[PDB]
PDB file of C-alpha atoms in Angstrom:
ATOM      1  CA  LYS A 224     184.019 -24.522-165.814  1.00 35.97           C
ATOM      2  CA  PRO A 225     180.591 -25.828-165.961  1.00 32.65           C
ATOM      3  CA  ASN A 226     177.459 -23.489-166.077  1.00 32.57           C
ATOM      4  CA  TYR A 227     174.664 -24.975-164.010  1.00 29.89           C
ATOM      5  CA  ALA A 228     171.408 -23.095-163.879  1.00 29.75           C
ATOM      6  CA  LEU A 229     168.377 -23.741-162.096  1.00 26.08           C
ATOM      7  CA  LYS A 230     165.675 -25.372-164.222  1.00 23.75           C
ATOM      8  CA  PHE A 231     163.026 -26.911-162.145  1.00 23.91           C
ATOM      9  CA  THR A 232     162.024 -26.646-158.376  1.00 21.64           C
ATOM     10  CA  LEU A 233     160.216 -29.797-156.887  1.00 20.20           C
ATOM     11  CA  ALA A 234     158.250 -30.238-153.557  1.00 23.71           C
ATOM     12  CA  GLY A 235     156.081 -32.595-152.053  1.00 26.37           C
ATOM     13  CA  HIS A 236     157.996 -34.275-149.039  1.00 24.89           C
ATOM     14  CA  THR A 237     156.546 -33.079-145.657  1.00 25.46           C
ATOM     15  CA  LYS A 238     159.858 -33.794-143.576  1.00 25.53           C
ATOM     16  CA  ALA A 239     163.508 -33.843-144.085  1.00 22.28           C
ATOM     17  CA  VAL A 240     164.774 -35.466-147.361  1.00 20.65           C
ATOM     18  CA  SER A 241     167.622 -37.809-146.695  1.00 20.51           C
ATOM     19  CA  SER A 242     168.680 -38.969-150.254  1.00 17.14           C
ATOM     20  CA  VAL A 243     168.122 -38.224-154.047  1.00 19.49           C
ATOM     21  CA  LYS A 244     169.182 -40.692-156.756  1.00 19.52           C
ATOM     22  CA  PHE A 245     168.862 -40.740-160.547  1.00 15.52           C
ATOM     23  CA  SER A 246     167.825 -44.146-162.077  1.00 13.72           C
ATOM     24  CA  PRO A 247     170.639 -45.428-164.366  1.00 13.89           C
ATOM     25  CA  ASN A 248     168.356 -45.384-167.416  1.00 13.65           C
ATOM     26  CA  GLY A 249     168.137 -41.548-167.082  1.00 11.04           C
ATOM     27  CA  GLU A 250     164.253 -41.357-166.750  1.00 12.17           C
ATOM     28  CA  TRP A 251     163.637 -41.005-162.896  1.00 10.83           C
ATOM     29  CA  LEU A 252     164.805 -39.261-159.739  1.00  9.37           C
ATOM     30  CA  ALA A 253     163.886 -41.102-156.387  1.00  9.72           C
ATOM     31  CA  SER A 254     163.783 -39.257-153.057  1.00  6.11           C
ATOM     32  CA  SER A 255     163.840 -40.586-149.616  1.00  8.00           C
ATOM     33  CA  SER A 256     162.202 -38.816-146.435  1.00  9.11           C
ATOM     34  CA  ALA A 257     161.830 -38.703-142.746  1.00 13.68           C
ATOM     35  CA  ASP A 258     158.008 -38.539-143.861  1.00 11.87           C
ATOM     36  CA  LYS A 259     158.262 -42.476-144.399  1.00 10.74           C
ATOM     37  CA  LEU A 260     157.808 -41.991-148.104  1.00 15.06           C
ATOM     38  CA  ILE A 261     159.719 -42.574-151.293  1.00 18.02           C
ATOM     39  CA  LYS A 262     158.876 -40.218-154.228  1.00 19.75           C
ATOM     40  CA  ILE A 263     159.492 -40.760-157.877  1.00 20.62           C
ATOM     41  CA  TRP A 264     159.734 -37.691-160.091  1.00 22.01           C
ATOM     42  CA  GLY A 265     160.519 -37.132-163.764  1.00 21.54           C
ATOM     43  CA  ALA A 266     164.172 -36.710-164.275  1.00 22.13           C
ATOM     44  CA  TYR A 267     163.930 -34.175-167.182  1.00 22.21           C
ATOM     45  CA  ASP A 268     160.800 -32.248-166.272  1.00 20.81           C
ATOM     46  CA  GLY A 269     160.764 -32.527-162.228  1.00 18.33           C
ATOM     47  CA  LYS A 270     157.235 -33.695-162.625  1.00 15.61           C
ATOM     48  CA  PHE A 271     155.850 -35.610-159.610  1.00 14.04           C
ATOM     49  CA  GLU A 272     155.209 -39.330-160.590  1.00 11.45           C
ATOM     50  CA  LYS A 273     154.097 -41.059-157.557  1.00 12.27           C
ATOM     51  CA  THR A 274     154.518 -41.988-153.690  1.00 13.16           C
ATOM     52  CA  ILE A 275     155.790 -45.517-152.817  1.00 13.29           C
ATOM     53  CA  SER A 276     154.693 -46.194-149.238  1.00 15.76           C
ATOM     54  CA  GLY A 277     155.102 -48.900-146.788  1.00 13.54           C
ATOM     55  CA  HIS A 278     157.875 -48.161-144.239  1.00 17.01           C
ATOM     56  CA  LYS A 279     156.747 -47.574-140.746  1.00 17.80           C
ATOM     57  CA  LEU A 280     159.380 -44.920-139.905  1.00 16.71           C
ATOM     58  CA  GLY A 281     161.544 -42.436-141.785  1.00 14.60           C
ATOM     59  CA  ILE A 282     163.789 -43.568-144.552  1.00 17.82           C
ATOM     60  CA  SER A 283     167.575 -42.811-144.744  1.00 15.55           C
ATOM     61  CA  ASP A 284     168.453 -44.056-148.148  1.00 13.56           C
ATOM     62  CA  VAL A 285     167.136 -45.292-151.454  1.00 11.61           C
ATOM     63  CA  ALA A 286     169.148 -46.907-154.294  1.00 11.76           C
ATOM     64  CA  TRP A 287     168.272 -48.208-157.835  1.00 11.76           C
ATOM     65  CA  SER A 288     169.047 -51.446-159.388  1.00 17.49           C
ATOM     66  CA  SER A 289     171.374 -51.241-162.580  1.00 17.48           C
ATOM     67  CA  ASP A 290     168.448 -51.887-164.807  1.00 14.82           C
ATOM     68  CA  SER A 291     166.276 -49.113-163.146  1.00 13.29           C
ATOM     69  CA  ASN A 292     163.631 -51.773-162.431  1.00 12.79           C
ATOM     70  CA  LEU A 293     163.989 -51.994-158.725  1.00 14.33           C
ATOM     71  CA  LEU A 294     164.554 -49.846-155.783  1.00 13.40           C
ATOM     72  CA  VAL A 295     165.902 -50.618-152.233  1.00 11.20           C
ATOM     73  CA  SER A 296     165.246 -48.227-149.214  1.00 11.71           C
ATOM     74  CA  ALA A 297     166.635 -48.233-145.657  1.00 13.18           C
ATOM     75  CA  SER A 298     164.657 -47.372-142.993  1.00 13.07           C
ATOM     76  CA  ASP A 299     164.493 -46.554-139.134  1.00 12.75           C
ATOM     77  CA  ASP A 300     161.814 -49.372-138.952  1.00 11.73           C
ATOM     78  CA  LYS A 301     164.876 -51.579-139.075  1.00 12.37           C
ATOM     79  CA  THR A 302     164.042 -53.141-142.621  1.00 12.27           C
ATOM     80  CA  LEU A 303     165.096 -52.694-145.952  1.00 14.43           C
ATOM     81  CA  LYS A 304     162.268 -52.921-148.704  1.00 16.33           C
ATOM     82  CA  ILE A 305     162.867 -54.028-152.282  1.00 14.72           C
ATOM     83  CA  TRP A 306     160.531 -52.192-154.695  1.00 15.33           C
ATOM     84  CA  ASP A 307     159.233 -52.748-158.314  1.00 15.52           C
ATOM     85  CA  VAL A 308     159.199 -49.169-159.264  1.00 15.54           C
ATOM     86  CA  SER A 309     156.978 -49.406-162.391  1.00 13.00           C
ATOM     87  CA  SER A 310     154.175 -51.078-160.280  1.00 12.88           C
ATOM     88  CA  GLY A 311     155.089 -49.583-156.789  1.00 12.72           C
ATOM     89  CA  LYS A 312     154.922 -53.256-155.425  1.00 11.53           C
ATOM     90  CA  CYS A 313     157.100 -54.103-152.449  1.00 10.16           C
ATOM     91  CA  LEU A 314     158.666 -57.240-153.603  1.00 10.59           C
ATOM     92  CA  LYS A 315     160.612 -58.177-150.428  1.00 11.77           C
ATOM     93  CA  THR A 316     161.044 -56.729-146.890  1.00 11.57           C
ATOM     94  CA  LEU A 317     164.610 -57.463-145.538  1.00 12.77           C
ATOM     95  CA  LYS A 318     164.399 -58.151-141.731  1.00 16.50           C
ATOM     96  CA  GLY A 319     167.608 -58.866-139.720  1.00 15.54           C
ATOM     97  CA  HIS A 320     169.210 -55.580-138.664  1.00 12.56           C
ATOM     98  CA  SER A 321     168.734 -55.090-134.705  1.00 13.81           C
ATOM     99  CA  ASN A 322     168.673 -51.280-135.192  1.00 13.96           C
ATOM    100  CA  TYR A 323     167.881 -48.468-137.939  1.00 15.60           C
ATOM    101  CA  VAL A 324     169.137 -49.286-141.340  1.00 14.01           C
ATOM    102  CA  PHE A 325     171.082 -46.108-142.702  1.00 13.49           C
ATOM    103  CA  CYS A 326     172.479 -47.123-146.168  1.00 11.83           C
ATOM    104  CA  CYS A 327     172.006 -49.376-148.916  1.00  7.71           C
ATOM    105  CA  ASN A 328     173.105 -50.430-152.629  1.00  8.55           C
ATOM    106  CA  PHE A 329     172.632 -53.081-154.976  1.00  7.12           C
ATOM    107  CA  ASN A 330     175.612 -54.689-156.576  1.00 10.13           C
ATOM    108  CA  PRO A 331     176.351 -54.114-160.254  1.00  7.96           C
ATOM    109  CA  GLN A 332     174.820 -57.273-161.345  1.00  2.69           C
ATOM    110  CA  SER A 333     171.771 -56.327-159.101  1.00  6.91           C
ATOM    111  CA  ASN A 334     171.570 -59.776-157.498  1.00  5.96           C
ATOM    112  CA  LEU A 335     172.638 -58.589-153.975  1.00  3.39           C
ATOM    113  CA  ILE A 336     172.084 -55.745-151.758  1.00  2.98           C
ATOM    114  CA  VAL A 337     174.348 -54.460-149.114  1.00  5.62           C
ATOM    115  CA  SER A 338     173.147 -52.594-146.155  1.00  4.67           C
ATOM    116  CA  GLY A 339     174.665 -50.779-143.075  1.00  6.76           C
ATOM    117  CA  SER A 340     173.008 -50.040-139.827  1.00  8.47           C
ATOM    118  CA  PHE A 341     173.138 -48.233-136.469  1.00  7.47           C
ATOM    119  CA  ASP A 342     173.551 -51.622-135.360  1.00  3.73           C
ATOM    120  CA  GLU A 343     177.107 -51.291-136.534  1.00  2.00           C
ATOM    121  CA  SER A 344     176.899 -54.171-139.034  1.00  2.00           C
ATOM    122  CA  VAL A 345     177.093 -54.416-142.656  1.00  2.00           C
ATOM    123  CA  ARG A 346     174.740 -57.126-144.256  1.00  2.99           C
ATOM    124  CA  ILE A 347     174.438 -58.675-147.674  1.00  2.06           C
ATOM    125  CA  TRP A 348     171.228 -59.815-148.966  1.00  2.00           C
ATOM    126  CA  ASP A 349     170.019 -62.160-151.680  1.00  2.38           C
ATOM    127  CA  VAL A 350     167.692 -59.890-153.861  1.00  3.12           C
ATOM    128  CA  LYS A 351     165.633 -62.542-155.294  1.00  2.76           C
ATOM    129  CA  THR A 352     164.874 -64.472-151.959  1.00  2.57           C
ATOM    130  CA  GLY A 353     165.046 -61.431-149.815  1.00  2.00           C
ATOM    131  CA  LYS A 354     167.351 -63.480-147.459  1.00  3.22           C
ATOM    132  CA  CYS A 355     170.405 -62.321-145.496  1.00  4.96           C
ATOM    133  CA  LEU A 356     173.499 -64.288-146.729  1.00  4.78           C
ATOM    134  CA  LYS A 357     176.233 -62.528-144.571  1.00  3.72           C
ATOM    135  CA  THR A 358     176.450 -60.455-141.492  1.00  5.89           C
ATOM    136  CA  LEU A 359     179.784 -58.422-140.974  1.00  5.40           C
ATOM    137  CA  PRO A 360     180.805 -56.943-137.577  1.00  7.10           C
ATOM    138  CA  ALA A 361     181.903 -54.063-139.586  1.00  4.64           C
ATOM    139  CA  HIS A 362     182.385 -50.906-137.251  1.00  4.84           C
ATOM    140  CA  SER A 363     182.009 -49.591-133.686  1.00  2.00           C
ATOM    141  CA  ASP A 364     179.707 -46.933-134.550  1.00  2.00           C
ATOM    142  CA  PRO A 365     176.696 -46.515-137.018  1.00  3.28           C
ATOM    143  CA  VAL A 366     177.468 -47.479-140.562  1.00  2.21           C
ATOM    144  CA  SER A 367     176.908 -44.313-142.714  1.00  3.95           C
ATOM    145  CA  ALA A 368     177.630 -45.885-146.302  1.00  3.37           C
ATOM    146  CA  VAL A 369     178.117 -48.930-148.210  1.00  2.00           C
ATOM    147  CA  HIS A 370     178.828 -49.517-151.847  1.00  2.00           C
ATOM    148  CA  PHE A 371     180.035 -52.399-154.135  1.00  2.00           C
ATOM    149  CA  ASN A 372     182.960 -52.009-156.389  1.00  2.00           C
ATOM    150  CA  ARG A 373     182.782 -52.336-160.260  1.00  2.00           C
ATOM    151  CA  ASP A 374     182.726 -56.168-160.410  1.00  2.00           C
ATOM    152  CA  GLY A 375     180.877 -56.654-157.044  1.00  2.00           C
ATOM    153  CA  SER A 376     183.831 -58.500-155.668  1.00  2.00           C
ATOM    154  CA  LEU A 377     184.474 -55.902-152.918  1.00  2.00           C
ATOM    155  CA  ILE A 378     182.367 -53.649-150.592  1.00  2.00           C
ATOM    156  CA  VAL A 379     183.394 -50.328-149.060  1.00  2.00           C
ATOM    157  CA  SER A 380     181.857 -49.252-145.922  1.00  2.00           C
ATOM    158  CA  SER A 381     182.125 -46.087-143.862  1.00  2.00           C
ATOM    159  CA  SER A 382     181.284 -45.281-140.225  1.00  2.00           C
ATOM    160  CA  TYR A 383     181.104 -42.401-137.652  1.00  2.00           C
ATOM    161  CA  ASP A 384     183.897 -44.483-135.895  1.00  2.00           C
ATOM    162  CA  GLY A 385     186.183 -42.798-138.369  1.00  2.00           C
ATOM    163  CA  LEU A 386     186.986 -45.939-140.440  1.00  2.00           C
ATOM    164  CA  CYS A 387     186.665 -46.811-144.333  1.00  2.00           C
ATOM    165  CA  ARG A 388     186.872 -50.450-144.579  1.00  2.00           C
ATOM    166  CA  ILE A 389     187.004 -52.949-147.579  1.00  2.00           C
ATOM    167  CA  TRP A 390     185.431 -56.155-147.398  1.00  2.00           C
ATOM    168  CA  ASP A 391     185.566 -59.125-149.477  1.00  2.00           C
ATOM    169  CA  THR A 392     182.047 -59.977-150.604  1.00  2.00           C
ATOM    170  CA  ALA A 393     182.436 -63.826-150.719  1.00  2.00           C
ATOM    171  CA  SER A 394     184.704 -64.313-147.633  1.00  2.00           C
ATOM    172  CA  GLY A 395     183.675 -61.471-145.501  1.00  2.00           C
ATOM    173  CA  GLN A 396     187.131 -60.650-144.430  1.00  2.00           C
ATOM    174  CA  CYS A 397     188.077 -57.184-143.580  1.00  2.00           C
ATOM    175  CA  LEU A 398     190.803 -56.575-146.428  1.00  2.00           C
ATOM    176  CA  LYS A 399     191.630 -52.812-145.627  1.00  2.00           C
ATOM    177  CA  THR A 400     191.001 -50.094-143.163  1.00  2.00           C
ATOM    178  CA  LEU A 401     191.765 -46.710-144.561  1.00  2.00           C
ATOM    179  CA  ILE A 402     193.249 -44.075-142.169  1.00  2.00           C
ATOM    180  CA  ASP A 403     194.663 -40.629-142.699  1.00  2.00           C
ATOM    181  CA  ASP A 404     196.603 -40.230-139.365  1.00  2.00           C
ATOM    182  CA  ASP A 405     193.232 -39.027-137.711  1.00  2.00           C
ATOM    183  CA  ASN A 406     189.691 -40.335-137.115  1.00  2.00           C
ATOM    184  CA  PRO A 407     187.028 -37.930-137.891  1.00  2.00           C
ATOM    185  CA  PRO A 408     183.775 -39.500-138.485  1.00  2.00           C
ATOM    186  CA  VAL A 409     183.206 -40.792-141.966  1.00  2.00           C
ATOM    187  CA  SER A 410     179.596 -39.891-143.383  1.00  2.00           C
ATOM    188  CA  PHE A 411     180.040 -41.206-146.933  1.00  2.00           C
ATOM    189  CA  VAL A 412     181.975 -43.401-149.169  1.00  2.00           C
ATOM    190  CA  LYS A 413     181.783 -44.930-152.576  1.00  2.00           C
ATOM    191  CA  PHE A 414     183.823 -46.292-155.469  1.00  2.00           C
ATOM    192  CA  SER A 415     184.836 -44.205-158.285  1.00  2.00           C
ATOM    193  CA  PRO A 416     183.179 -45.314-161.498  1.00  2.00           C
ATOM    194  CA  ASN A 417     186.405 -46.850-162.780  1.00  2.00           C
ATOM    195  CA  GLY A 418     186.728 -48.850-159.308  1.00  2.00           C
ATOM    196  CA  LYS A 419     190.195 -47.573-158.650  1.00  2.00           C
ATOM    197  CA  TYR A 420     189.441 -44.929-156.099  1.00  2.00           C
ATOM    198  CA  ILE A 421     187.306 -44.353-153.177  1.00  2.00           C
ATOM    199  CA  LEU A 422     185.575 -41.039-152.461  1.00  2.00           C
ATOM    200  CA  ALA A 423     185.076 -40.271-148.736  1.00  2.00           C
ATOM    201  CA  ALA A 424     183.361 -37.594-146.809  1.00  2.00           C
ATOM    202  CA  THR A 425     184.442 -36.805-143.190  1.00  2.00           C
ATOM    203  CA  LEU A 426     182.600 -34.368-140.755  1.00  2.00           C
ATOM    204  CA  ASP A 427     185.549 -31.932-140.741  1.00  2.00           C
ATOM    205  CA  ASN A 428     184.639 -30.156-143.926  1.00  2.00           C
ATOM    206  CA  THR A 429     186.539 -32.648-146.132  1.00  2.00           C
ATOM    207  CA  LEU A 430     186.189 -34.908-149.157  1.00  2.00           C
ATOM    208  CA  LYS A 431     189.065 -37.280-149.919  1.00  2.00           C
ATOM    209  CA  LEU A 432     189.749 -39.281-153.097  1.00  2.00           C
ATOM    210  CA  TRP A 433     191.800 -42.420-152.051  1.00  2.00           C
ATOM    211  CA  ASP A 434     193.856 -44.803-154.104  1.00  2.00           C
ATOM    212  CA  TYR A 435     192.364 -48.196-153.155  1.00  2.00           C
ATOM    213  CA  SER A 436     195.220 -50.432-154.374  1.00  2.00           C
ATOM    214  CA  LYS A 437     198.047 -48.261-152.471  1.00  2.00           C
ATOM    215  CA  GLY A 438     195.592 -47.286-149.327  1.00  2.00           C
ATOM    216  CA  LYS A 439     196.642 -43.520-149.832  1.00  2.00           C
ATOM    217  CA  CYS A 440     194.826 -40.262-149.973  1.00  2.00           C
ATOM    218  CA  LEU A 441     195.405 -38.700-153.563  1.00  2.00           C
ATOM    219  CA  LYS A 442     193.282 -35.689-153.388  1.00  2.00           C
ATOM    220  CA  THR A 443     191.263 -33.508-150.954  1.00  2.00           C
ATOM    221  CA  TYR A 444     188.396 -31.300-151.944  1.00  2.00           C
ATOM    222  CA  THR A 445     187.684 -28.371-149.308  1.00  2.00           C
ATOM    223  CA  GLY A 446     185.865 -25.183-149.179  1.00  2.00           C
ATOM    224  CA  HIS A 447     182.378 -26.393-148.188  1.00  2.00           C
ATOM    225  CA  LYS A 448     180.835 -26.932-144.702  1.00  2.00           C
ATOM    226  CA  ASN A 449     180.033 -30.455-143.345  1.00  2.00           C
ATOM    227  CA  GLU A 450     180.241 -30.822-139.778  1.00  2.00           C
ATOM    228  CA  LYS A 451     177.066 -32.766-138.919  1.00  2.00           C
ATOM    229  CA  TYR A 452     174.858 -34.318-141.761  1.00  2.00           C
ATOM    230  CA  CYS A 453     175.227 -37.185-144.003  1.00  2.00           C
ATOM    231  CA  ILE A 454     175.942 -35.571-147.233  1.00  2.00           C
ATOM    232  CA  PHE A 455     176.565 -37.819-150.102  1.00  2.00           C
ATOM    233  CA  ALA A 456     179.337 -36.752-152.843  1.00  2.00           C
ATOM    234  CA  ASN A 457     179.128 -37.591-156.557  1.00  2.00           C
ATOM    235  CA  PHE A 458     181.400 -38.163-159.545  1.00  2.00           C
ATOM    236  CA  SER A 459     180.014 -36.104-162.300  1.00  2.00           C
ATOM    237  CA  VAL A 460     181.103 -37.685-165.634  1.00  2.00           C
ATOM    238  CA  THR A 461     178.819 -36.690-168.381  1.00  2.00           C
ATOM    239  CA  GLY A 462     180.620 -33.515-169.318  1.00  2.00           C
ATOM    240  CA  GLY A 463     183.760 -32.247-167.382  1.00  2.00           C
ATOM    241  CA  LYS A 464     184.964 -34.420-164.524  1.00  2.00           C
ATOM    242  CA  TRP A 465     183.690 -32.977-161.275  1.00  2.00           C
ATOM    243  CA  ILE A 466     183.088 -33.795-157.759  1.00  2.00           C
ATOM    244  CA  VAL A 467     179.723 -32.503-156.411  1.00  2.00           C
ATOM    245  CA  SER A 468     178.504 -32.257-152.802  1.00  2.00           C
ATOM    246  CA  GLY A 469     175.767 -30.555-150.748  1.00  2.00           C
ATOM    247  CA  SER A 470     176.956 -28.380-147.916  1.00  2.00           C
ATOM    248  CA  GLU A 471     175.766 -27.012-144.640  1.00  2.00           C
ATOM    249  CA  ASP A 472     175.864 -23.348-145.904  1.00  2.00           C
ATOM    250  CA  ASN A 473     173.103 -24.098-148.154  1.00  2.00           C
ATOM    251  CA  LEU A 474     175.113 -24.307-151.496  1.00  2.00           C
ATOM    252  CA  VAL A 475     175.966 -26.978-154.018  1.00  2.00           C
ATOM    253  CA  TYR A 476     179.718 -27.347-154.470  1.00  2.00           C
ATOM    254  CA  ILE A 477     181.430 -28.459-157.548  1.00  2.00           C
ATOM    255  CA  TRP A 478     185.126 -29.032-157.741  1.00  2.00           C
ATOM    256  CA  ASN A 479     187.375 -30.042-160.741  1.00  2.00           C
ATOM    257  CA  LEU A 480     188.373 -33.772-159.856  1.00  2.00           C
ATOM    258  CA  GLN A 481     191.968 -33.229-160.869  1.00  2.00           C
ATOM    259  CA  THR A 482     192.910 -29.897-159.775  1.00  2.00           C
ATOM    260  CA  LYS A 483     190.744 -29.842-156.533  1.00  2.00           C
ATOM    261  CA  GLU A 484     189.637 -26.079-157.353  1.00  2.00           C
ATOM    262  CA  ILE A 485     186.072 -24.940-156.802  1.00  2.00           C
ATOM    263  CA  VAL A 486     184.468 -24.534-160.389  1.00  2.00           C
ATOM    264  CA  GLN A 487     181.003 -23.491-159.162  1.00  2.00           C
ATOM    265  CA  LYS A 488     178.653 -22.894-156.150  1.00  2.00           C
ATOM    266  CA  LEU A 489     175.009 -23.379-156.795  1.00  2.00           C
ATOM    267  CA  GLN A 490     172.865 -20.810-154.808  1.00  2.00           C
ATOM    268  CA  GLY A 491     169.147 -21.137-154.208  1.00  2.00           C
ATOM    269  CA  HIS A 492     168.488 -23.343-151.225  1.00  2.00           C
ATOM    270  CA  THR A 493     167.622 -21.823-147.981  1.00  2.00           C
ATOM    271  CA  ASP A 494     168.720 -24.444-145.775  1.00  2.00           C
ATOM    272  CA  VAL A 495     171.491 -27.216-145.737  1.00  2.00           C
ATOM    273  CA  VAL A 496     171.839 -29.113-148.976  1.00  2.00           C
ATOM    274  CA  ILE A 497     171.611 -32.810-147.674  1.00  2.00           C
ATOM    275  CA  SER A 498     172.097 -34.576-150.962  1.00  2.00           C
ATOM    276  CA  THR A 499     172.873 -34.370-154.538  1.00  2.00           C
ATOM    277  CA  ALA A 500     172.937 -36.541-157.489  1.00  2.00           C
ATOM    278  CA  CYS A 501     174.123 -36.328-161.086  1.00  2.00           C
ATOM    279  CA  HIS A 502     172.188 -37.587-164.219  1.00  2.00           C
ATOM    280  CA  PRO A 503     173.801 -40.505-166.060  1.00  2.00           C
ATOM    281  CA  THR A 504     173.743 -38.880-169.441  1.00  2.00           C
ATOM    282  CA  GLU A 505     172.668 -35.185-169.398  1.00  2.00           C
ATOM    283  CA  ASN A 506     174.579 -32.524-167.344  1.00  2.00           C
ATOM    284  CA  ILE A 507     172.078 -32.452-164.806  1.00  2.00           C
ATOM    285  CA  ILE A 508     172.309 -32.083-161.075  1.00  2.00           C
ATOM    286  CA  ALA A 509     169.611 -32.734-158.473  1.00  2.00           C
ATOM    287  CA  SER A 510     169.986 -31.164-155.106  1.00  2.00           C
ATOM    288  CA  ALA A 511     167.734 -31.523-152.039  1.00  2.00           C
ATOM    289  CA  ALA A 512     167.485 -29.235-148.927  1.00  2.00           C
ATOM    290  CA  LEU A 513     166.603 -29.840-145.186  1.00  2.00           C
ATOM    291  CA  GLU A 514     163.374 -29.061-143.583  1.00  2.00           C
ATOM    292  CA  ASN A 515     163.455 -25.326-143.512  1.00  2.00           C
ATOM    293  CA  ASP A 516     163.556 -25.472-147.287  1.00  2.00           C
ATOM    294  CA  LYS A 517     161.912 -28.730-148.311  1.00  2.00           C
ATOM    295  CA  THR A 518     162.782 -28.253-152.036  1.00  2.00           C
ATOM    296  CA  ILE A 519     164.534 -30.433-154.656  1.00  2.00           C
ATOM    297  CA  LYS A 520     166.130 -28.640-157.539  1.00  2.00           C
ATOM    298  CA  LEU A 521     167.024 -29.650-160.982  1.00  2.00           C
ATOM    299  CA  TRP A 522     170.021 -27.806-162.396  1.00  2.00           C
ATOM    300  CA  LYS A 523     171.373 -28.011-165.901  1.00  2.00           C
ATOM    301  CA  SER A 524     174.900 -27.125-167.582  1.00  2.00           C
ATOM    302  CA  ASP A 525     176.046 -27.087-171.275  1.00  2.00           C
ATOM    303  CA  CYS A 526     179.318 -28.761-170.154  1.00  2.00           C
TER     304      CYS A 526
END
């Protein structure tokens, strides 16, 4: 079992945090907030680095390019922005969604961005030109998450319509729809590091690990509370193989991926834990709580 202990508590955002992400190179944590700001923090010391401003309304998600040089953000102002993190420059503003942009990610090459929106579509954008390449009529409710697979040939999307869908990046065809005899809103999805599986959160207090190739649920993780908020889940891969998630009871939950047992609950936040992220090389978790709490915490484990 891991032994995560609180190391640093960070604060600075003035409204609800929506997402935290560690840079792939391990140096930084990025956070996004309803305060319209992206903030960069030192991954190892929690030291505030800088604000990156420019969005006109709140931000729902931020994501790093695979070389850690760029960030993309998704905002209620109906744009995505691509940022050069080192300089803070806005490289491109991506206009095309007809309503709030809720989620975003680069492909592993980091030449494409995928976005999902309240407009119920998924869009695929060229990073260098900032132009939209494809629009997919993906869902019948807002799109909560979008993620490329290991080689970038597939995109997984999720929606409050209860569907997880897998799209062919090149053709835009809807290849698969995952259904578990029910339809609770899906608030998050992502491919596993090896690309074989899809991890999905639904607003019935459940995380599910799906076999992509088979279209079948392999494992479920339960014990936490998640009926309202868009709470990501993480694969922790630096030490023991865990699933990590925030929870609406103010705790971070950590499960054994294989056995599905809870192995730790992290106590310290005083409001919903809206987001978590796992450091790429060290056994470090970042957690962020909602607006009654307003802190981001860095926790470290020996394994």
